[PDB]
Amino acid sequence: TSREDSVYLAKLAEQAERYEEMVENMKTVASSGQELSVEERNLLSVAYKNVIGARRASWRIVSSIEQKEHQVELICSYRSKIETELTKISDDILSVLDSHLIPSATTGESKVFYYKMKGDYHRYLAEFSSGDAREKATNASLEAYKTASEIATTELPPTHPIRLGLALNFSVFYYEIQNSPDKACHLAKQAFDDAIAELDTLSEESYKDSTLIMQLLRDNLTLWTS
């Protein structure tokens, strides 16, 4: 199957709700020489986000069951079988992110997008780890976000959905992983105020996507400030 054939099967698997195969279709495309297009890396992002989304949901259910005999152990190994699948998915996406995606990225917008994913799946890892793995995941997550944030501030307008979506996930990292509501609100409020000032820079094609993420920023700001 050719390069465009794998991209079509990813769009096929997307609507078929078979997201595990959507990864293999996109994993065999991003590793090619070409750089992923605007829609291509969207399928790559959509694919993995659903693959790890199911285990994140599955892990969050099994944790609350234990947080509420041989049943004590049966849940502990089941909850760890999901954590192994959560690591396999994160290590798989982070490996191609660090071997091909980020190195071969030349566009400033491409670098922000991939460095954001690096922060995202490092953050998924730190959601459940404890000890050395949680401390290692927290550091790499913040290092990739800060790198994306520095490149986004100089190469992207403040209303760009990739720049706004980054600060949204970066702010969630501060509140949920680093437990710093003051650092989350500060970055989230600044990201909202930076985009409000340059409203003329809101592009026609990127208009609806930018307004949506700004509302997601304010919803988090309201929740964190209680």
Binding site: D120, P161, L168, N169, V172, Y175, L216
Partner: peptide, 8 residues
Amino acid sequence: RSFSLHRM
């Protein structure tokens, strides 16, 4: 619980 970027 905070809300992260969903599908675009």
